[PDB]
Amino acid sequence: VWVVGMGIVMSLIVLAIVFGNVLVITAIAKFERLQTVTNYFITSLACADLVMGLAVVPFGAAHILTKTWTFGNFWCEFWTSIDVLCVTASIETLCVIAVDRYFAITSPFKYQSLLTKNKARVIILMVWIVSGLTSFLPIQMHWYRATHQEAINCYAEETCCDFFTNQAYAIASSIVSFYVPLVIMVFVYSRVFQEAKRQLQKIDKSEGRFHVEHKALKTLGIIMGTFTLCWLPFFIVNIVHVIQDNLIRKEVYILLNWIGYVNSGFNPLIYCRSPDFRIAFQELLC
Numbered sequence: 001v002w003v004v005g006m007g008i009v010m011s012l013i014v015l016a017i018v019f020g021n022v023l024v025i026t027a028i029a030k031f032e033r034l035q036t037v038t039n040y041f042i043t044s045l046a047c048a049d050l051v052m053g054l055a056v057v058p059f060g061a062a063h064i065l066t067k068t069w070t071f072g073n074f075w076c077e078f079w080t081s082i083d084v085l086c087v088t089a090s091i092e093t094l095c096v097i098a099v100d101r102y103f104a105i106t107s108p109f110k111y112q113s114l115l116t117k118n119k120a121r122v123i124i125l126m127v128w129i130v131s132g133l134t135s136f137l138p139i140q141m142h143w144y145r146a147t148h149q150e151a152i153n154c155y156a157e158e159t160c161c162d163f164f165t166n167q168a169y170a171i172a173s174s175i176v177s178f179y180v181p182l183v184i185m186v187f188v189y190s191r192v193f194q195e196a197k198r199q200l201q202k203i204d205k206s207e208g209r210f211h212v213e214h215k216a217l218k219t220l221g222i223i224m225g226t227f228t229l230c231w232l233p234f235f236i237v238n239i240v241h242v243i244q245d246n247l248i249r250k251e252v253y254i255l256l257n258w259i260g261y262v263n264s265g266f267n268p269l270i271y272c273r274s275p276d277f278r279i280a281f282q283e284l285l286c
């Protein structure tokens, strides 16, 4: 009953991810009003999420359900590289969005000059190049491999493929993928909240006698509680399991990894709540 039951959940996850991340892309492509410098970062994020949902989730689900890797030994390194690439490219895009929002409020007069359609493309290409220099190059050159008997036995068997990595690669990959964007987003959003509070105070001092921070708190909570709660638990055990051998089990690692995969299915709800997006979604369907 467990085999039949979980397959339904995995298929539902796949369908939700694909349907969520294709609609945004086609709405942005079809409509000329939504083509804005802001909306290119959402385009890149949606592309990364769609690639993840199509390439990573189905094969991981099949590997779990079948319990053996029926495909060749060459196709598992490619799968791991794709997974790492998508994961590390789906977070720096959020960091870029946060920085772009910071520059709008902090410098209102100079926002148009600093951000131009030519610079957005360069930023996106740099993000994707950096993502590809930590996923394909070290994995495909066999620099991440660990040196112990279980790892060698797993490497020499075609039907078995698990993740065994070194201390240095794990630390470097986690630092590049998660922690630096986390610090940058924390600083950015704290400053934005400070500016919003100052504006509210000024309005209250000016027009106080007439009736005419819940909004900022709710928005920032939705922004920063669906990302930290989804990715932070995994990137701690990622550091831990290479320092203490018996502290972290394999099942906990796999489940905490799969919890962070569903974040790609939530992004359209969080970042595409604008009325302009709603009108486009209504026009496409119905």
Ligand SMILES: CN[C@@H]1CCc2c(ccc(O)c2O)[C@H]1O
Pocket (backbone or CB within 6 Å): 080, 083, 084, 087, 088, 163, 170, 173, 174, 177, 257
């Ligand atoms: C196969 N799962 C991988 C394992 C390690 C890893 C992931 C994502 C980002 C990283 O920086 C990593 O080091 C996970 O997606």
